[PDB]
Design a protein around this motif. Structure first.
Motif, PDB file in Angstrom:
ATOM      1  N   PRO A 221      14.796  32.588  84.205  1.00  0.00           N
ATOM      2  CA  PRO A 221      15.744  33.470  83.505  1.00  0.00           C
ATOM      3  C   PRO A 221      17.193  32.963  83.499  1.00  0.00           C
ATOM      4  CG  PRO A 221      14.363  34.676  85.063  1.00  0.00           C
ATOM      5  CD  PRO A 221      14.228  33.235  85.398  1.00  0.00           C
ATOM      6  N   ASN A 222      17.595  32.131  84.469  1.00  0.00           N
ATOM      7  CA  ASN A 222      18.942  31.578  84.471  1.00  0.00           C
ATOM      8  C   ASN A 222      19.077  30.613  83.297  1.00  0.00           C
ATOM      9  OD1 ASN A 222      21.334  30.126  84.918  1.00  0.00           O
ATOM     10  ND2 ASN A 222      20.653  29.282  86.885  1.00  0.00           N
TER      11      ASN A 222
ATOM     12  N   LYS B  63      11.605  32.092  93.359  1.00  0.00           N
ATOM     13  CA  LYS B  63      12.794  31.259  93.511  1.00  0.00           C
ATOM     14  C   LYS B  63      12.577  29.920  92.818  1.00  0.00           C
ATOM     15  CE  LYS B  63      15.420  28.469  96.562  1.00  0.00           C
ATOM     16  NZ  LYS B  63      15.860  28.292  97.982  1.00  0.00           N
TER      17      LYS B  63
ATOM     18  N   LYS C  32      17.922  29.806  92.325  1.00  0.00           N
ATOM     19  CA  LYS C  32      18.152  31.245  92.236  1.00  0.00           C
ATOM     20  C   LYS C  32      16.829  31.988  92.374  1.00  0.00           C
ATOM     21  CE  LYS C  32      22.437  30.312  91.147  1.00  0.00           C
ATOM     22  NZ  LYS C  32      23.604  30.503  92.016  1.00  0.00           N
TER      23      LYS C  32
ATOM     24  N   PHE D 158      14.634  35.483  91.632  1.00  0.00           N
ATOM     25  CA  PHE D 158      14.560  36.583  90.682  1.00  0.00           C
ATOM     26  C   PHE D 158      13.382  37.474  91.036  1.00  0.00           C
ATOM     27  CE2 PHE D 158      16.337  32.934  88.497  1.00  0.00           C
ATOM     28  CZ  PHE D 158      17.495  33.427  87.958  1.00  0.00           C
TER      29      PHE D 158
ATOM     30  N   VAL E 179      11.846  40.307  86.102  1.00  0.00           N
ATOM     31  CA  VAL E 179      12.841  39.648  85.260  1.00  0.00           C
ATOM     32  C   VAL E 179      12.305  38.331  84.704  1.00  0.00           C
ATOM     33  CG1 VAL E 179      15.179  38.826  85.153  1.00  0.00           C
ATOM     34  CG2 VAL E 179      14.654  40.765  86.607  1.00  0.00           C
TER      35      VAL E 179
END
Ligand SMILES: [Zn+2]
Ligand SMILES: [Zn+2]
Lengths: 301, 135, 303, 301, 143, 301
Positions: free
Chosen positions: B92-93, B119, B125, B127, B131
């Protein structure tokens, strides 16, 4: 013996407590005993996909301090993997900074045997910054254990302050003070990390509450650009540090800033004996000589 | 056939399982039945590896996979959440290097009270699976 | 004795087959036994009037691999002539590596550098000797020879200067067969075909690489210069001529796929992992062709 | 009668409840009865010190819709006061947008008798946006009183959403739902304002909690640029609105967005009868004809 | 057989899953039965799809022409065939194809694709509704 | 019946022969009898997503010559959204865009507001071919049975494809295509011509045919696509100098869609054969034509 030879240095979350100790020790030894031809005939790539001339000068100085050659650039329809696949054929190590998170990790998957060193990958990691911080705290305090460490300013966004907390939690009995406005607090993941290790941390609203206790006053760079100009006026008013704030300070206490320090530390501090942010930056050369030499030799000395 | 069969697949997860895991890129005969409401997929002369079944945990958690060496069952199993999920998920990043680059996605997996944490191998990151999975 | 000492390296059309053989030879020799201080105390000016940082990095790495010092710029962001810039820099340095937007600029430099040799890193649409040299070195190192090869060249053959260079240079060796695989609007120019005919070297046109894959030894992919074409017509080029691993079932095991890079829209990444993918190895070889050139122009002797 | 003739329109916090009612009414009347030569022979300055072509097109269309002339620009060692002192001699009204807060207010101190209209002054005010919002809520709902109003998204930074809350608190019995992540909450000053008027407001984490009750679903534009890309991934996942979320919606309910709506309202909504953000923008012409005409005539009709 | 619905026989194997994906054929609540790499001497190895209580129109079947030219659709009322059909190349094909012209407004924007269709000697020409450029179906279909 | 009332003007391939004759007729009649208040109280949007101030000025002048108002601009939110907004503001949308299909895309989101295409990337430019036709009309007296030479780059210019397509909709025309091999008229145009049994030949020099030509149509050679070496030979071959007009017919007219720096030497300007500034002048009436035809149901002239 040297378990970092031919390893990539990507994320502080991958350096073990023992690895940390090894770098620090190598740094102190390199600082005390110059070894200016240790890396003669090596060529190193100084790849600043994202400009950052303080960082780049520090690294490249480390490189020549070990007598290496340096090639690079400071600013694309072709992939990053292709770029790295080409550059690995040229050089013996790739020092690289990139706007996007994961860029150093990804470089390792295409650099083959050439070690990748992370000079900062967007919002993620900046291993060398945390390394030269530790080397400065340790060199000034005599230890990395059982310290009183305040971190003042913006703690939500600086990658290096999350980094530095993680690395200090690899040492024990440290007491943390988090002095920051609500909109810029230490993130939850860091607090939880500290709780799961039974490590001591408290919140405060002003450095005066705790100044008497701190061994390290670690000022972050507040990212004003994220904030309303009004909101930042209130932050800077609260959290700027001037020399008048250092009456209780312990004689051994040091003020550290990753730099640039325009809106955080008044120039009053510069003249006081607690001012250590330029010594801190200078120490970056040895944390970086250390990292380069460890990844490019199996033999110590 | 002497292969593998997947029973009790949540409706509208059969077509996704065929899609995300490239199950129709074989030469064997495949039997598929959507909305009985339980979807089910079956593949002849195809055996699934250990972790290969595990990867279905996130999409068909309560579902059964049965193995066939005869005209009867040779081994039944359910999917258990894996240590890592490669290839099928998207980070998602949007600043993640993973995008537009010739690498396979990879996420460490971690159960929580309410959500599953994923991760990313690259941008580091973490999530909530809700998400990550929202396309 | 060493007929390249103190000589300029400006054009593939100025190197005799003997000059070519000397470079290739010096390169391979340097590749197998490095000479890391052959050029100590030499200072070389890396003047990229037009940015080209893969070219710059490969050249500057070469210089350092022979222990030379490097000074220069990659400036793409100016009333004084080029003649003066060169007049000045020749008093500073010992050799000039130069890239420039205008054709003929390295030639023009040599007329103002005095005794200082200039090497051409590209002068607009004209010349780029070093690319063609490291190509030759790569084809040789992979095949064992530059003669009696089947060499296919796919993509844009009208516009890439390096592919003209490479045909000219391969025509100095014997018995090569060239296959030109390109859309009609981007064909090999007539002057190149004329040259190959005047030497009676075999060449045919094709519309599809599958016609010839079985025979090919070097598949040399060019970078289609998208910017010249309509995105619509370019859709048809890219569709026809892109190379994926499904295209390499017939290929001979000795065959190597070459691309001067960047290859975003020419070679699918599925190819990367096959044994035929040699375009990054190709680019690494720029180190040795460029070490070679530097060495030969800056010493009479040989270690 | 017309207490806005020759007044500046600077801040919503200066328009009285009666002034608000006057504009709205004038807008509705101008919408229903075109008056295309009402401002013939007037020249108006369209001064976008800060570009914003949606806003500028809307205003300038308002201007010609009343048959005025328009002169202006869309992008300096000389002061703003000097600029305004010159431009007042040229024109009959100054419509102006500026990056810095206070620019319209300051213009009034040097425009003399020429009325200044604020098209947005940095982080402060954007009166016309709040005006065309109200005109759209009122025209669709039949009223501005006793409404259920949800405001979803970023509520910390959008000036127009603070604006719109203030103006709706000038009407009574309204129920407010604030649906936003903690880092982008409604600011304290707004909540206190609501408490001091005994006006009803609740917090929620998702539009589904309350969708059944809302008459107005007011989506803000989340300012991603302030956030970490990861953090924004989680926000957009939570708060984006798609047509599937509108099963409980009241048949009279309307979805409003100040625009641009890329990462907030999926295109599913466009086809549903609840989609009113383009009608909302269209309504900006009448809220702006209204403001221009009221400040440039004492006589109604 | 089934109680009621539609059946698609003699689908080129490996074009079956494509039909389920591109035409969103599994986005119903009715029962669907499908078989990939089925054996027939009529086709060799084929694919088959069957859908209860769902009927395809003329154009819905024509729209299969470009992917499974030789294929058959049978309608099943009361468990017997009431209408038999083959796909014919349509006048236009919407939604499923992508414009090869990368500069086409088509791409970044919230509209459906659309190409008018015209047979030729060797290929089918597909002319985009937006950029008005015409492509060989092989260029359009090549991903 | 004005079969263009409220219709979109997108592509020359969508204009019927009667549609063309209607435009030309309205142009000639508006040119002869100006109608400067025909469009009073109309607001038109001049949306140049891609700058083109020659084209923009000509359009905006047409707009004012019919007394319309104008709003506009030059150089993550979709085009669909901007168009959806602007159609609520205005009565007609003139737009230029770098991407092919943008005007057609606009029409699907403009509602009842007609969009006129000022150029959509490499696809279409209707008004250019309209004013070219209107110019051949007025100078030759007819669009049928003319000898039309087209000199320069014929592979890439959209305007020359448009113009060929539209002349093939009139009868008995003979075409001469005079261009270098790399920039030939494309097959699809040659195919269209064969399929209508229209006579056309190739030549490599304008001298071969000058005696017969009634319209000499110079294109802007797209230098940017070609090598400067390649371009040197083209410019020498195909540039037009006044010495080249000894054979020309007294009725022959030279046309250039403009700019003509490297195609028509200044020698030509003074000869009576030069009509490229008059051609550009005529664009006013062809664009006035379309605006009037699209925004009035009746036109009595
Ligand atoms: Zn990621
Ligand atoms: Zn298209």
């Amino acid at each position: 013996a040297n378990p970092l030879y031919q390893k990539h240095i990507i994320s502080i979350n991958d350096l073990s407590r023992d690895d940390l100790n090894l770098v620090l020790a190598t740094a102190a030894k390199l600082k005390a005993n110059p070894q200016p031809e240790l890396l003669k005939h090596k060529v190193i790539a100084s790849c600043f996909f994202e400009a950052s001339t303080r960082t780049r000068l520090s690294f490249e100085t480390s490189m020549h301090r070990l007598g290496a050659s340096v090639v690079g650039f400071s600013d694309k329809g072709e992939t990053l993997a292709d770029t790295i696949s080409v550059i690995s054929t040229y050089v013996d190590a790739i020092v690289m900074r990139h706007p996007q998170e994961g860029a150093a990790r990804l470089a390792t998957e295409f650099s083959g045997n050439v070690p990748v060193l992370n000079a900062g990958d967007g919002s993620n990691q900046h291993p060398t910054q945390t390394l030269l911080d530790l080397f400065t705290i340790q060199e000034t305090q005599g230890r990395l254990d059982n310290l009183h460490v305040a971190m003042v300013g913006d703690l939500k966004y600086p990658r290096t302050v999350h980094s530095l907390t993680q690395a200090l939690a690899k040492f024990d009995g440290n007491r943390f003070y988090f002095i920051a406005p609500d909109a810029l607090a230490m993130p939850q993941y860091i607090l939880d990390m500290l709780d799961e290790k039974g490590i001591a941390w408290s919140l405060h609203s002003s450095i005066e509450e705790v100044m008497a206790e701190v061994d390290i006053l670690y000022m972050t760079r507040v990212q004003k650009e994220r904030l309303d100009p009004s909101e930042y006026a209130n932050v800077k008013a609260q959290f700027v540090l001037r020399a008048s704030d250092l009456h209780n300070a312990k004689a051994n206490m040091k003020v550290l800033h990753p730099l640039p320090r325009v809106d955080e530390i008044a120039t009053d501090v510069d003249k006081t004996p607690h001012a250590w942010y330029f010594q801190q930056a200078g120490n970056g050369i040895f944390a970086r000589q250390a990292l380069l030499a460890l990844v490019l030799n199996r033999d110590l000395v | 056939k002497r292969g593998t069969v997947i029973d009790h697949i949540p409706a509208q997860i059969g077509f996704k399982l065929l899609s995300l895991f490239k199950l129709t890129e074989t030469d064997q005969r495949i039997t598929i039945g959507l909305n009985l409401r339980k979807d089910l997929i079956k593949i002849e002369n195809t055996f699934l590896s250990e972790d290969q079944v595990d990867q279905l945990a996130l999409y068909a958690p309560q579902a059964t996979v049965n193995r066939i060496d005869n005209y009867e069952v040779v081994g039944k199993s359910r999917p258990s959440l894996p240590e890592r999920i490669d290839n099928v998920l998207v980070c998602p990043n949007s600043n993640c290097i993973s995008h537009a680059e010739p690498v396979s996605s990879s996420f460490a997996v971690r159960k929580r009270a309410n959500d599953i944490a994923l991760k990313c191998k690259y941008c580091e990151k973490e999530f909530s699976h809700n998400v990550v999975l929202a396309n």
